[PDB]
Design a protein around this ligand. Structure first.
Ligand SMILES: [Ca+2]
Ligand SMILES: [Ca+2]
Ligand SMILES: [Ca+2]
Ligand SMILES: [Ca+2]
Length: 223
């Protein structure tokens, strides 16, 4: 996260870290046994880390649970990142508490101008490289589809939206991929891609979760 702020420990209780020996992506807990992340975060051997603030220190509220299965969206296209969404089932159910809590799925898509909370452990610099240890947060509005497609001509599908600031300075960044965009208490986005980080006229691009609620609910119910 570039240009954001320290969330505060466990203030985003649905935020997970995906670990394969190191943090490599975020995700969002949607029930006791399921996480949603980005398809471009797929790999084998994922451990889901819940209750994290400092990802380099055991602080006493963590749950570490291996994934038992991953399901990449049937139409995921890695060349274009269309349908950049993946479900991860936990080998055992997470213990839900104050600091480990699920986030509701949308019943409706969100409108442009809606303010959302974006979070992650990704790079905090827009030209250099510095990775935080504690979770960072950013408040950012959903941008008009029209400004999104103008920023990225020919690359925005109906399954993507842009959020952030056209002037730059505040954005998601590498290491944030797969993590949440929450608006009005609903998981509306997944950190997907962008051109650099926090650059002018290059806002972050996010998977449009509201298009996938039927697929999410059906897949979970059958697995
Ligand atoms: Ca559910
Ligand atoms: Ca920790
Ligand atoms: Ca194609
Ligand atoms: Ca990365």
């Amino acid at each position: 996260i570039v240009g954001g702020y320290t969330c505060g420990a466990n203030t985003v209780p649905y935020q997970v870290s995906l670990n394969s020996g190191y943090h490599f992506c975020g995700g969002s807990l949607i029930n006791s046994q399921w996480v949603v992340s980005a398809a471009h975060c797929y790999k084998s051997g994922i451990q889901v880390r819940l209750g994290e603030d400092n990802i380099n220190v055991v602080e006493g509220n963590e749950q570490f649970i291996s994934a038992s299965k991953s399901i990449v969206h049937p139409s995921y296209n890695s060349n274009t990142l269309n349908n950049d969404i993946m479900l991860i089932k936990l080998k055992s159910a997470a213990s839900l508490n104050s600091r480990v809590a699920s986030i509701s799925l949308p019943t409706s898509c969100a409108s442009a101008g809606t303010q959302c909370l974006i979070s992650g452990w990704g790079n905090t610099k827009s030209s250099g490289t510095s990775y935080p240890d504690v979770l960072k947060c950013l408040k950012a509005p959903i941008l008009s589809d029209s400004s999104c497609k103008s920023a990225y001509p020919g690359q925005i599908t109906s399954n993507m939206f842009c959020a952030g600031y056209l002037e730059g300075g505040k954005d998601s960044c590498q290491g944030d991929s797969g993590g949440p965009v929450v608006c009005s208490g609903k998981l509306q986005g997944i950190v997907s891609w962008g051109s650099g980080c926090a650059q002018k006229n290059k806002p972050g691009v996010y998977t449009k979760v509201c298009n996938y609620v039927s697929w999410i609910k059906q897949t979970i119910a059958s697995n």
